[PDB]
Structure formats: structure tokens, C-alpha cells
């Protein structure tokens, strides 16, 4: 959301488009725009966090399962706590003894 929140996508993009329009970008392509394509890139800019567990890889070896996608209890909180989201994701597929 820090990159493509709907409030940003509306306000900032319409302001940039209006500035481009008043400068005359749509009359002729000479003008240089300033982020008038933000709604086209929703969910693409810094939308993920990938962490490889080096200790787990060292413990497992050459043959291992690669990766897992983990959805948190709160769907839109990883951007607030990147480290907590990664640790909660790594809580899942660990060595287990009972």
C-alpha cells in the first residue's frame, strides 16, 4: 500500500496528469511526465518479500524443498512489520519433534 494505495492512485495520479495536461503533454509528446502511470503498476512495485533461510539450507543440504508462499493472519500488515511477517512465515515449515 505504500506504493499503490487507492488514495495515492486517485489524488497523486490525477494531480500529475493535470500538471502534464497544463504543460501540454497531450497536445505534443515533448513534455516529460512525472509518474502519470501509477495505476498501471498496482501490485508490482516492492510488492513482495522473499527470504532464504541460510541456516535451514545448511541443515537440509543439496536436496531440499525450495520455497513457500505464506499469507499472514492480517493480510495487509507485512509492510508495517516486514521482519515479523518473515518470521511468522518461517514459523511454518520447521523441524518438528513431538
Amino acid at each position: 500500500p505504500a506504493a499503490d494505495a487507492i488514495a495515492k492512485l486517485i489524488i497523486e495520479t490525477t494531480g500529475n496528469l493535470l500538471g502534464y495536461f497544463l504543460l501540454g503533454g497531450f497536445s505534443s509528446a515533448g513534455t516529460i511526465a512525472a509518474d502519470i502511470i501509477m495505476p498501471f503498476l498496482v501490485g508490482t512495485i516492492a510488492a513482495w518479500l522473499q527470504w532464504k533461510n541460510t541456516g535451514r539450507a545448511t541443515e537440509l543440504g543439496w536436496v531440499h524443498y525450495w520455497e513457500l508462499y505464506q499469507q499472514g493472519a492480517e493480510t495487509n500488515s507485512w509492510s508495517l512489520a516486514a521482519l515479523a511477517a518473515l518470521r511468522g512465515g518461517f514459523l511454518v515449515g520447521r523441524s518438528e519433534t513431538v
Binding site: 513457500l68 499469507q71 511454518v92 515449515g93
Partner: protein
């Protein structure tokens, strides 16, 4: 000799000594083998 005693009880099958606990555990193990790989990791 064999026909008409324990040797035909064996043909009868699980009429004499046979417990429910390991039978239920084996059924659960077979179902777990069937369903565990397809259960999600979440």
C-alpha cells in the same frame, strides 16, 4: 483334526483374539497416508 477347531476358527477370521485398537489405528494410518500429501501446508 484341523477341520472343526481353531484351524477353522482361522478360516472364520477375527472371531477369537482380535482387538479394535490396532485396527482403528491402521485404518487411521491408511487414511493419513492417502490424505496427508494433499493437505495444504498452511
Amino acid at each position: 483334526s484341523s477341520g472343526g477347531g481353531p484351524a477353522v476358527v482361522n478360516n472364520y477370521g477375527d472371531i477369537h483374539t482380535a482387538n479394535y485398537d490396532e485396527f482403528y489405528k491402521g485404518q487411521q494410518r491408511r487414511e493419513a497416508q492417502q490424505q496427508a500429501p494433499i493437505l495444504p501446508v498452511r
